[PDB]
Structure formats: structure tokens, C-alpha cells
Amino acid sequence: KVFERCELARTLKRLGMDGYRGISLANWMCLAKWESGYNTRATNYNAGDRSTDYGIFQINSRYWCNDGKTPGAVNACHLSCSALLQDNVADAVACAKRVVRDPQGIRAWVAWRNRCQNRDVRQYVQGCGV
């Protein structure tokens, strides 16, 4: 499903993402926007290393979820990558929380550095009532 901006913002708030490990809700919104356009069924195959990015946050199969076909992969989130393609974002959120518990934090996603870091991200949560 494709979330409406404010609809997603209120959902992430409810799932306890605001300020999780020091990451503001507007940052998570900026990340979801650039990674998938708020689309939970988005998948992106990386032919260069044989891995696939899954879901609204575009989480990688090499370390976070298991899809069986990625070489030398681990499943830190202990989830089938299929779980990251549901309309209910609870599992994707639980896994994103795991990703940011590692040293890099939000920096794990290169898109965040390119389009969110050091920018005015207030626009992503404006008018949403969060």
C-alpha cells in the first residue's frame, strides 16, 4: 500500500519511532519518502551484489531479513523478507529499530545522508498533528 504523508506520520508515532535512539520522527519520514515514496510493496534488486531491498524503508536482505537467495547473508531482524512487504508496517518498524541500534544509526541508509542529513526536514511532518 502507498501511505498518505500524514497517515504514515501518525502511524510511526504510534509505533514509538519518534526519538527512537535519538532519531526524530521527521527523519524517519524523510527516509521513507526517499527510499520508497511511502510504498510498502517496493522492492529493488541490486544486481551488483545479489541482494534485494524490501519495503517502505528498503531494508537489505544481506543483513536484516532472509529471502534465501542472497549469498552469505544474515537475518539480524529474524524475519522473512516477505514480512517487510505487508500493508501493516509493524514488522518493518521493528526491523528498522534493529538497524539503528548498530553504531551507524540512521546513517546505515545512504539515501538519508544524501537527502535528509543537515536539511530542514520539518516539512515531512508539518500539519500532521504529531
Q: What is the contact surface with Na ion in residues (CB under 5 A)?
A: 61, 66, 73, 75
Return the number of the residue (56 or 81) whose C-beta is nearest Na ion.
Answer: 81
How far apart are CB 54 and Na ion at their closest, in Å? 10
Instruction: Kindly name the residue from 7, 53, 87, 102 that is annotated as catalytic.
Output: 53
Give the position of cell 524475519.
79
Return the number of the residue (64 or 124) whose C-beta is nearest Na ion.
Answer: 64
Instruction: Kindly name the residue from 7, 35, 87, 120 that is annotated as catalytic.
Output: 35
- Of all residues in this chain, which one has the CB nearest to Na ion in the complex? 73
Annotated catalytic residue 87: no
Closest CA to 121 of 23, 29, 3: 29
Rounded Cα distance, 113 and 82, in Å: 27
Contact 65, 78 (CB under 8 A): no
Annotated catalytic residue 120: no
Q: Where are the alpha helices (DSSP H) in the chain?
A: 5-14, 25-36, 90-99, 110-115
Active site residues: 35, 53
